Design a binder for this molecule. Sequence first.
Ligand SMILES: COCCCOc1cc(C(=O)N(C[C@@H]2CNC[C@H]2NS(=O)(=O)Cc2ccccc2)C(C)C)ccc1OC
Ligand SMILES: *[C@@H]1O[C@H](CO)[C@@H](O)[C@H](O)[C@H]1NC(C)=O
Length: 336
Amino acid sequence: TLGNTTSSVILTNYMDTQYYGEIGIGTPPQTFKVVFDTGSSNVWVPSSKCSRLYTACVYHKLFDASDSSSYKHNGTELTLRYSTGTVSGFLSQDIITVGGITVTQMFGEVTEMPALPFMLAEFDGVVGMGFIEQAIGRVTPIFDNIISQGVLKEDVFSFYYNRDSQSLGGQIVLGGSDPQHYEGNFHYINLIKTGVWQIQMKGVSVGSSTLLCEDGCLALVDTGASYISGSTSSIEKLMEALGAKKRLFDYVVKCNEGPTLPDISFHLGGKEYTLTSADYVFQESYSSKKLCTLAIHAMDIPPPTGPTWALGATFIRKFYTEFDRRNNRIGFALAR
Ligand SMILES: COCCCOc1cc(C(=O)N(C[C@@H]2CNC[C@H]2NS(=O)(=O)Cc2ccccc2)C(C)C)ccc1OC
Ligand SMILES: *[C@@H]1O[C@H](CO)[C@@H](O)[C@H](O)[C@H]1NC(C)=O
């Protein structure tokens, strides 16, 4: 069922690495800062039942079911193994408020939340925007429950991620897209298979030559990822070409050599998506005496999904993204 409604969630841009919005859980609503992540399909927030021995839980907002009159017990164990770090807890049900839309949703109450990386997290939890096929415990994803209400104008959602600042950090439109944040026309690429927000990539070029992904590869379009990532192998070739040196968790260049770095292109569908050094270098200074990080890192995503590249916030900043559930495709337009 299709309605005549669109709803928007305003996002906060933290250091160009974390983009988060607000949701309410329970009656009265308990508010959480959440990441709207297309790379995952579960909703989870830290729990009141999380041991204060986890420092992450001392530093984030915790859901207390004893304060909610709309809470429905479940308790089924849940383990979400993200390749950045794992979280575990149990399933609960309550009413979630996201941009005006009120939905009864099953989510995880996280009781084990490691300091790495959650002590670095500005957000409390995650709202998975992926498909039921990738949902742990086969829990219905929040967008599937919102679609079911037959209130949205279109069975689509859009992401706008701004460059850091009094300005808008970003925006998610549920049921459509905001033309004030894109220009030109959307160019769609169909998903390889339903269940994942992954598309086919025809090549990655450094300068003017297809130095990588020559025989074709995969591209996961991931709103919950900070960077553009590829396999350890691909990133090694890429960096060697850039003149960038490998540190423990990132790659750097001397700050003075940042503006001089070549364009990086991504052949997706019938279009070339180009990022300049201004789009992928954290130009903190122009000093020959300082190191500057890149918004590209290695990440070996396991099968079935991987090995794959991941187009995170680095990519979405340049290109406004529309996720079309009705036609199993992703649209891109130049962000305004
Ligand atoms: C841009 O703003 C977003 C916030 C950026 O900050 C953080 C992000 C994360 C992070 O990595 N998360 C999960 C990943 C995003 N997508 C799915 C998942 N990928 S994964 O599991 O690592 C590979 C994979 C993909 C698909 C299938 C299988 C395996 C979050 C959302 C829990 C952790 C700490 C962060 O802050 C210190
Ligand atoms: C938890 O929710 C699922 C939803 O299908 C249900 O099958 C399961 O029995 C529930 N468990 C409890 C204890 O309510």
